[PDB]
Amino acid sequence: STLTFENMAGVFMLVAGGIVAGIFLIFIEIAYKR
């Protein structure tokens, strides 16, 4: 004797976390619409 996922590994969880959190806000718009 070239990094790794590192910070991106938690980004995908944030990316995936946004997807599941997306459906949370979907009904919020529906809630005010009704």
Binding site: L3, F5, M8, V11, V15, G18, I19, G22
Partner: protein
């Protein structure tokens, strides 16, 4: 002993490695499926919506449509700043390899083929 004296000499994937390039390939399928799935519920898509979400990866001023929706474009805003931090990381490591630059050299010793080849080896 005995040595040889010489002068001094005068690859996009060479920085980093092949490990990185097998990741965003997943994001290509994932981001494409996410936009259609959200749009499918409320009810473009493959024809046009694929242009914007892949186009977001590159900070370019191409004139493209902006999909509407009070919550439809909320996640893409979250998806938006992933690229800038990615590209800033994707360019910072490049300068490190210039710090880690090696010397290519030409020969390895008296036993090298170049020394052992009088002719038939270019000039």
């Amino acid at each position: 002993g005995i040595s040889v004296m010489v002068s001094r000499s005068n690859a996009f994937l060479e920085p980093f490695s092949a490990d990185v390039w097998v990741m965003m390939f997943v994001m290509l399928l994932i981001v494409s499926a996410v936009a259609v799935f959200v749009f499918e519920y409320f009810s473009f898509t493959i024809g046009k919506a694929i242009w914007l979400l892949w186009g977001l990866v590159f900070n370019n001023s191409v004139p493209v449509q902006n999909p509407k929706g009070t919550t439809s474009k909320i996640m893409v805003s979250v998806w938006a700043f992933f690229a800038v931090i990615f590209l800033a990381s994707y360019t910072a490591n490049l300068a490190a390899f210039m710090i880690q630059e090696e010397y290519v050299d030409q020969v390895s010793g008296l036993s090298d083929k170049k020394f052992q080849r009088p002719n038939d080896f270019s000039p």
